[PDB]
A paper describes a structure:
NrdR senses the concentration of nucleotides through its ATP-cone, an evolutionarily mobile domain that also regulates the enzymatic activity of many RNRs, while a Zn-ribbon domain mediates binding to NrdR boxes upstream of and overlapping the transcription start site of RNR genes.
The structure of ATP-loaded NrdR (2.96 Å resolution from two merged cryo-EM datasets) reveals a dodecameric assembly of three tetramers. In each tetramer, the ATP-cones of chains A and B, and those of chains C and D, interact with each other, respectively. For the Zn-ribbon, the domains of chains A and D and those of chain B and C interact, which generates an intertwined tetrameric structure. ATP-loaded NrdR forms a dodecamer that cannot bind to DNA.
Numbering used by the authors:
A (entry chain K), B (entry chain L), C (entry chain I), D (entry chain J), E (entry chain F), F (entry chain E), ...: 1 to 147
């Protein structure tokens, strides 16, 4: 990493410790040229921006609850819901963005949910793909037969 | 009744009053321990059996909130939702079923909801008409085109 | 209470039980004339309507937290904050309304908060009394000297 | 680093990459237990000491949210709030204090906030200028009339 | 359904069978985790609302046990208790009340119990006829002498 | 205490310790004449003999539950029930017997229960005083008017 | 299942939910002909009838404790006892009866216990097979040599 | 001694009395906190070391209950069991062992139990004579035929 | 307090917060002349120096345990021991020293212990007052008679 | 025996060996679960009954530690303490008491301790000779002067 | 095992029970010749002697903490540290000694620690192998290259 | 500040006093609940950021203890350690770093420690100079030979 003071191309790591909660790693680095020591923090935090304008930490439990409610009346097991939540969280974190919108969360859910149950996928994409008339629903039923 | 402040198991009744309509009784109570007064209302409210064994008081607010969450992203005004809720409550009161469940409450909304919107109606009716297959959605789409 | 079926002026109570959680009392009444038995529930539930349009149960902890944050930098004890929360909850419940707006909650807070601390009261009423210019603040400082 | 999915204490580093700017490092990590990959970013971020001993990364979002909550009920646009946050961040970066606390961050907002509004400025400056008395509010009101 | 052995949340259905009478369905299920099979029976059983909001399946065994505990120390044979339970169940089935409570079940026992015994009847009827005063007991003693 | 070995009229206590659970006190005594050390245990254990022939430790919770069920439909508070249980336990222990029958427990309950509620006392003594006909109940109602 | 009202040969399931505790599944069915909706409950409850005449829920812990006491002084591990309890519970539930006698529980235990330990099996069957004289014990020792 | 009512750690001694026999001391105690009195008895009771390190007071009731549970299903009267318990207690008192264990107590029952019954004796002696093999049972059956 | 930078005679407090654990108070002060802000911490920590050379936080539980062991065989209650520990802690903290030796702790204990029990005080001062011969013990017994 | 590593309830015995002296048996055991071996030693050790009901193996180390803590601040060498411990163990082994308590172990130390020191002896003998009064200490001081 | 009374070459085991905490097994044995019953205890206790002269039970957590601190700044995982602690405990227990010195504990740690990390092994053996000058460190670095 | 005795959240300030030096303030406080007084000291102490985010007051005692534990087994006197600690504290005070971490404190010890000893210096400098390889130890050994 570039030294904050002299902008040297590289620096050496002289201390590293994982935080007690395990979320972040605190490192202390020293610049080889100017011999100056600076502190850096490495995190894996993820945030979702609510439609009301408030950002809150990502939660797999809320995704599982939402997909469970959307799968009401269908034969879905708890192991399948947990696996779907894990897949959604992994796919969301793979983008690398620190914060994302809940619409993108729903779009990510749309993938595994189709493999889970077709009725729940249809009644979920009717909201998150913005269906406007019966024709849009009929086209979606046709895409599912093609896939 | 348990005190709302200090959770004392028993509370006296300072006074009681029957409303002019006669379907409600309003009581003022005082906790023997903390000597802090509060108020209670007793009504012969219509109960609905949930999907579990728990019975819950009927509330038009929950019906309106559910249909609005089903109507999100659609051009549905609040006046139409209020009229739909009033019609559903009137229907469930007029039927006078021996054992009223929340499934029957969800069934009473399909009628009024069909006139308001078709996308929201299809979403809502996909649950309480127990949709098992995509072909069942197509049959409802054909019925909506006929109506 | 009036009998739901025959609208008799009064009815007799033949059963009563406090709920396990203690929030409500379930009574069973019998009409003296038509000999018909009906069930009533007595509750003390209280709800606050958020500015976002969602109603949630009243909480004294949130009131205490808000007044504590508004009293930042001032000599306020935890016993005083707990007593203020108790007073606010008692005054709110005394109105008898099942649901109220958070603006009314702030107006109720405005009473005891003035007795608690003047600076916090000023910086709280500047929001909940809708002060517009410096003149409104100066008039409030004058009312506090008069009181 | 603890795995975000299964909370395994240690995680390998699949790969690392230094950004073009050079002030950040982006790493892809994999959990040895569940074999689920995620991403982390390490930056030499400016830390602020809170009112407790806990140090928190600097975020313009928190400053903007706080000033907006102070500016509620006032004709303040979002562009003005963004400009105020940018000015505050630039000021705190330019001062280069040896030990930067959140109190100094709250002090850097009074300047820009005085131009935007007077009610919101008086609310915000009543805290970080440590207002003890009503007369202190009057002196600030006189200063605002002069400026 | 949760497995009775290892409490796994979901269980498959190995097979199902409809009984000759047609009012019951007997299923054999297997837990996916432990692969241990068990059996379940589904019936459209008559539910009674307890003194709380909890609904419980009707059981003549509970009625017989309660009346026997009320008949302790009295010359009442088991055949008479069985006949009383059968009569009470037949009465509650024949009335076909819209909302059947345990209070009505306790009321259906007073009739048959009056013939069997007078001490046990007076004990049992002191509850469900809501006896408030000693004079109410005397009026029931006079009624028993008349009958 | 008499020495177990030589039957000396008195002995001296040389060690004493209360048990960790606090139920018993273990003492070590030495005989002044023969200089012999022996161990004694002091207990306050109390047992009730069930009608099935099994002896179990005395419990105030069971007494409270029984009197609560016998007071069904009557205005009895939890503090009153706890005080009645305490009085029953104290009166039972005052006799000094290590074991007693549940009939004696009911006879002890009969005292405070009359002061608590007359209806519950009547329906409890009808079982624990062995009433045989309506005449026995009428005589009991007369004794209550006299007292 | 047959419709309770019109006795139609079959009915359709329109709602299903597993209970929170997971013991039962509540279904709502609708008759295709008369369009009437009725509620059914599916359970896996099991009861054992004590020799005193009281029925209590089946417990694997009590079976394990009994076989452990019967295996006193013998080399039996806790894993073996847990497996024996699981086998006993599975064999008991395989019969399909909702309630069974403890004698049948002992007869079920007699199977795996013989494979576990011969001495414990002998001293357990001497009670649950009703041995009368030494000849019955000698014959049992001979059956074990044959098997 | 801990109070039986409120569990206060220490209790005073209101009075003490030595019995006429001299082997017991009866004390009346009062709790300083709740001021509720109770009674205690101190005796130099004979202790038996259980299979663990815990020592328990000797009780003929436990011996009689154990032998009766061993004698279930056999024509053994209660008088014979009482005589057996008296003989066992007399034997264990007369031996005067330095360290008396419950194993020795179980050994003192085989003698008297041999005369009462043979099936119950064989069951009981299969434990405390440490039966390892079926041949050991056969040798005891041969000994019983000789005696 | 003097300003750390310019040594001004006095400074103003502009921020104060009690720590979450409540042990310390963190204040932020500003010098009136040089307008410089500095952080101070107020603590009430107390340490005892073990004879092995290690300093550990003061504990009332250890003092109570020590005095309890020194009072073995004497009539001392738990309330008295707790009060003695409280008195010892208060007297130790009254000196104002952050760290003290365990010998001073014993000297502080010597005060209340004499009022508690004379035998324990003698056997405790024989260690913490360094008695050398029987004459020193005799003189101490004489001082106790004088006091 | 529970495994020391993973706490598995049962452990096999890899091998056993009887020592040359014959008073000990050394076994090597292996846990079935983790397959980690350990060693155990079984001896017919002399047990002492503590002040509670718990029996503890006799250990000269505890006696030496206790007397040393009593001898602190006194010119007592470690060789003298070892000789005292050896003498006490020899005495308690030679007496062969039927029921050996820790009080008798504390009594066996007074003899040897009288020769070693007088201050430490007086401290130690103030406990196990049950000193009630200062005059009892004076009588022991007179006895020490005579001896 | 040899009989404690008559020194017979072998004895038979007639009772065995594992302790509730699982640390020890209590056996009761009987001598075939003199027919005398004696109690033995089998334990797996392990103790470490601190350099201050106090013996305390062996703890794997302390070993893990020590090696973790010695591995500061090195890539060591928690699973590796737990495995090293398990190996150290197993190797220590394999010697069969009931008590050992902490120097031997460090010597045991020296084995796996070399396989874990070379820098930590060097900085740990510099203390537990008593390095005196730079030459001793250089020789150790040479042994590591050879191994 | 929380009371050290009863943990009451808030404590009054009985009195305050500024020390002659002026860098400390000594206050006497009293708890409102228990009315037990204690003392507190407030100083503008130099804080060091630990390897985590927690800041800790600087203490020469910790530095001396750490270096002594590093110097164990070496001929280093306590006076030399005190001089080293004084030099390290003077150096860290004289540098006046903007953000002082414990890593910099560990770096300030290498200088003075090089003169005192070479083995202890090599141990201590193997951590804070971040030794990755054995060759890095050899380079430091060569540097020590040069110096
Ligand atoms: N904290 C959270 N972490 C992760 N995903 C979340 C979180 N909160 C909500 N979600 C996801 O976002 C979806 C919500 O989408 P939507 O934008 O309609 O809701 P919202 O605006 O958050 O809800 P609300 O109506 O309560 O304001 C949920 O179905 C869920 O999958
Ligand atoms: N207490 C109530 N009063 C009136 N209408 C209700 C009540 N509870 C639910 N409803 C409405 O009746 C329908 C019942 O929906 P649904 O079967 O999903 O409810 P539920 O029992 O709450 O389900 P779940 O408990 O699984 O979330 C919806 O339209 C809902 O808005
Ligand atoms: N659940 C609650 N129960 C009781 N009082 C509440 C509750 N939530 C908020 N309040 C009160 O209402 C006040 C909030 O007023 P305001 O209308 O500005 O907030 P809001 O709209 O609820 O907040 P938000 O900005 O998070 O949507 C709080 O200071 C508190 O006293
Ligand atoms: N463990 C107990 N401790 C104290 N009192 C008890 C206990 N168990 C029961 N009781 C008292 O004894 C009364 C029971 O009297 P009764 O002889 O009719 O019952 P029982 O024979 O114990 O009951 P069951 O019918 O269950 O065998 C209860 O009302 C209660 O007051
Ligand atoms: N709640 C229970 N669930 C399952 N099995 C049980 C339960 N209670 C007892 N059992 C089984 O039944 C056996 C008891 O048989 P038995 O008929 O002799 O006892 P009981 O009549 O229940 O006992 P008691 O003498 O206490 O009245 C036990 O060994 C155990 O295996
Ligand atoms: N952490 C502590 N906090 C407060 N008081 C303590 C603490 N530890 C010990 N004490 C007090 O100090 C006394 C100990 O005095 P002493 O100097 O003989 O012990 P020590 O050197 O600490 O013990 P050890 O022999 O275990 O090293 C105890 O009786 C107790 O009152
Ligand atoms: N297991 C043991 N083996 C040998 N000697 C012991 C043992 N336990 C205690 N002792 C010694 O015997 C005497 C008993 O002292 P004391 O009565 O105070 O012990 P205690 O039962 O441990 O007391 P407490 O449990 O109340 O601390 C002391 O001299 C003690 O060192
Ligand atoms: N209770 C324990 N159980 C097992 N191992 C231990 C225990 N306590 C310490 N150890 C081991 O012994 C090592 C300590 O060696 P050392 O002799 O230097 O310490 P010590 O004398 O016990 O410590 P102290 O300086 O605190 O008195 C630790 O690194 C650890 O591996
Ligand atoms: Zn640089
Ligand atoms: Zn209250
Ligand atoms: Zn009516
Ligand atoms: Zn993982
Ligand atoms: Zn299962
Ligand atoms: Zn004697
Ligand atoms: Zn039908
Ligand atoms: Zn008490
Ligand atoms: Zn200054
Ligand atoms: Zn293991
Ligand atoms: Zn022998
Ligand atoms: Zn206090």
């Amino acid at each position: 990493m570039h030294c904050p003071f002299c902008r040297h191309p590289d620096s050496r790591v002289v201390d590293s410790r994982t935080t007690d909660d395990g979320t972040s790693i605190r490192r202390r680095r020293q610049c080889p040229d100017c011999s100056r020591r600076f502190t850096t923090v490495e995190t894996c935090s993820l945030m979702v921006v609510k439609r009301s304008g408030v950002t809150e930490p990502f939660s797999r439990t809320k995704v599982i609850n939402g997909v469970r409610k959307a799968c009401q009346g269908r034969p879905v097991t708890e192991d399948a819901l947990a696996q779907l939540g894990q897949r959604v969280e992994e796919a969301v974190r793979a983008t690398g963005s620190a914060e994302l919108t809940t619409h993108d969360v729903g779009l990510a859910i749309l993938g595994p949910l189709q493999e889970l149950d077709l009725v729940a996928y249809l009644r979920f994409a009717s909201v998150y793909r913005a269906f406007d008339s019966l024709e849009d629903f009929e086209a979606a039923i046709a895409e599912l037969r093609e896939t």
